[PDB]
Amino acid sequence: MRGIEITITMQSDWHVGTGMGRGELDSVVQRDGDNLPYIPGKTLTGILRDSCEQVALGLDNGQTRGLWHGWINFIFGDQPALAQGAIE
RNA sequence: ACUGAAACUGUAGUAGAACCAAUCGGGGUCGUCAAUA
């Protein structure tokens, strides 16, 4: 099911950073292949994931692991780099 | 003889400190004017 879109409307001035500046600039924004500003999909997943995890916390009554947090790992995938021990 | 997965370039930081829009000045007072025939 492709054909869904997300629209982002920027309501204040915005800065997807590059972690660095250049010359006289101390922070510069990411630009796409057309030299235009954009939000990278890795940034967009991270922000959207984080907010579905905010919703999950409420639905899980603050339980950091539970049924609704499992739904985030369903929708957004597990985060195996953070898990430790014998995850089967 | 078979695409790894998953991961927010973010986090903290007041474009600000200093600098008088100011210095001097009585709202005052007296001699003509004009050039020809």
Side-chain angles (χ1 to χ4, degrees), chain A residues 20-55:
Chain A
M20 71 176 96
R22 183 166 189 171
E24 69 283 351
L25 296 185
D26 297 277
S27 296
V28 299
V29 307
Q30 304 206 20
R31 292 173 176 262
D32 67 18
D34 305 289
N35 189 242
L36 305 190
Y38 82 125
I39 301 152
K42 195 71 61 69
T43 288
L44 193 52
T45 49
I47 286 296
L48 184 69
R49 186 189 187 112
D50 191 87
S51 303
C52 299
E53 290 169 345
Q54 281 294 347
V55 175

Side-chain angles (χ1 to χ4, degrees), chain A residues 9 12-13 16 18-19 28 32-34 39 47 52 73-74 76 80 87:
Chain A
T9 300
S12 72
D13 309 307
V16 184
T18 55
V28 299
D32 67 18
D34 305 289
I39 301 152
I47 286 296
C52 299
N73 283 55
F74 183 62
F76 294 93
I87 283 68

Side-chain angles (χ1 to χ4, degrees), chain A residues 1 6 11 15-16 34 43 60 62 71 73 80:
Chain A
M1 183 161 59
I6 288 158
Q11 304 190 123
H15 182 91
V16 184
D34 305 289
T43 288
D60 274 344
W71 275 99
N73 283 55

